[PDB]
Symmetry: C3
Subunit: 275 residues, 3 copies
């Protein structure tokens, strides 16, 4: 029995039940969304996560396999920290942290045969190994004064249930495999330098990647799918997306309004420069 | 016979044609998008509809069934009301209304067997009962002056044809059942108070829920779907979306420009407080 | 053989491999995104492409066929023109052009029998004719001074490989046929008038249509798909999308802060105009 086998557990006139048991190297990555409120620059609106794609190409045992991964988080906890109600105090109205109560989702896909026309799957299971994820060092760029830095945080990701999912994008749509992960706090705790907060567990959402190009976890997955016996059929992969056109229109109207306001402000600033 | 049947009208090696006939509780909900123009606060750029998700769990005859319902509208008319060309008159560039010519779409999904691998359907039919949808009281927060309140509006939703649809979201992707509703205006009219507009029919797009948690309508549906004979196959549902990255980029450039402008304004206002 | 044949190359009980050989009239259209930076109005942020939907209805040989097309571009080159660092020089931070190294994707879909339940396709091939896409005239509306006009640009689209794709939209989701096009630069060049740039091949991303309703190209396609034997099955087409709720929330917060800032500004002008 090989490591990357391909079996036919049944075969009808057109369709066929095939079994696929294959090793994988999930090279995934987080991505953070920072939002800085207006005013002076001491007030932050949100620091959250975003579903983060990463496509790559790794070597199997003599095969070059192109892969595609997409990470995300759910059930994260929304902490806050307000030093006061003034324009000059450092305040973060909301930032997200990962803990036991939350879960981490990783969608995975490859260019192998297991995924080409995978729409039905059963007997799905996987044996993944646990890893560690440490937070980064994010220096809050303040307009004037000292520079606080969010530094620390370490959480171990433990394997959990496996399912299917779909990785939609502006280029491709993939019927993908969804590995779930639970969390356990570790000794390195995250804290903001020059602040009265420290020794609290979790992983920050400012810079989870720690500057790493990716986090890597090895695995194996076994399943049984329905594929056409003729191995020439192809399911649609690429996309041409035009979703949220109302949102595009709202953004256009907001751009028009902000351009008119900036033109008004610039004219009122320039009239005083004619002496 | 049964009220929640599952019949086998045909069967082959791997596939099969199953007939499902089930009662359901369509608990849907409207949602509004109130955009307020800049300036002083007397001018409103648009008040539109937005497709509204709502997920719940209700009790069948000894079963606890999880469900998910997405409401939308189509063919809604656009009314407008301008009281003057000044910054100090209450003007609504556009507000959306529902009438006979328009239609209301409701995509419905449950965790039961009928929807687990539904990609093909025929002999689709449905028996739905009519309900009433009424508008609440949306008080326009005018900085100064009186307080216009958009109030009233009632419409009768009558059943129409049923079809298929796909509910996409940032979490789940659901091959769902699309119930369609036609409208007949009722006696209660919608009106903005302290304003020269009244005795016009439809539904206000401001507070269509009337402060309610949902609008419930019972129903029953019958169909014939193609399912793998092995009742263990699962179709991808969950997602991790990264759509409209270019839109996110434009929003980020907008936010940076807006923060720079706000910093300029705040420095200009702060320089005049040094005595 | 008819120009719009439909043949059966294999038929089991529930499924059947149906061959289709049909003529099509792809009428597509570019769409441009223009983001103008703030300040006076002398700096433009981006002039890029946006995937563009276009639905039409044309006449087959005694039949009326509704269609849906979606044009996109990949691998475009990012040029830019900056003539000075001052707020009064005309600058364009980044604008897109198309050349040999780029490709033009066109997703196509019809209401015909070929696209009713198409999820699997083999033996795909098509005979498409080549056309010429010519850019138009975009007048950069500067606040004051002269009015440069980006005028010209011609490029010939030639047939290339064919694949599948999925057209996602806020109304319909279509399992569609993806036609590729490669580019050969033509003689008419595009040049910004009243500027030091001219005689550079490609197509401009401001007005590609040249005031046209669409770009027409006729073709023929030939495939073999899996269709249930019963000609009554239907695959979900319509949608009800609520994706990017986080983006909607960001936009709402941005609109709130922008209204607050415009209110503060107009209040400063009212107190400075209340003597």
């Amino acid at each position: 029995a090989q490591a990357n086998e391909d079996i036919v557990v049944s075969k009808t006139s057109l369709w066929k039940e095939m079994q696929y048991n294959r090793d994988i190297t999930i090279r995934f990555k987080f991505a953070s969304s920072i939002v800085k409120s207006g005013g002076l620059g001491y007030k932050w609106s949100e620091i959250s996560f975003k579903p983060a794609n990463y496509q790559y190409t790794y070597t199997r045992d003599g095969e070059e396999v192109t892969a595609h991964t997409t990470c995300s988080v759910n059930g994260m906890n929304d902490f806050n920290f307000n030093g006061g109600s003034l324009p000059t105090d450092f305040v973060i109205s909301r930032y997200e942290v990962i803990k036991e109560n939350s879960y981490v989702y990783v969608d995975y896909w490859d260019d192998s045969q297991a995924f080409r026309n995978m729409v039905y799957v059963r007997s799905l299971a996987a044996n993944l190994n646990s890893v560690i994820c440490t937070g980064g060092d994010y220096s809050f760029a303040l307009p004037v004064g000292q520079w606080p830095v969010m530094t620390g945080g370490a959480v171990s990701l433990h394997s959990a249930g496996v399912t299917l999912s779909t990785q939609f994008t502006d280029f491709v749509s993939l019927n993908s495999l969804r590995f779930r992960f639970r969390l356990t706090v570790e000794e390195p705790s995250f804290s903001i330098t020059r602040t009265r907060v420290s020794r609290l567990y979790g992983l920050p959402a400012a810079n989870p990647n720690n500057g790493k190009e990716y986090y890597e976890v090895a695995g194996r997955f076994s399943l049984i799918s329905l594929v056409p016996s003729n191995d020439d059929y192809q399911t649609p992969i690429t996309n041409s997306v035009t979703v949220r056109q109302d949102l595009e229109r709202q953004l256009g109207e907001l751009r028009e309004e902000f351009n008119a306001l900036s033109q008004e402000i610039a004219m009122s600033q320039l009239i005083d420069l004619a002496l």
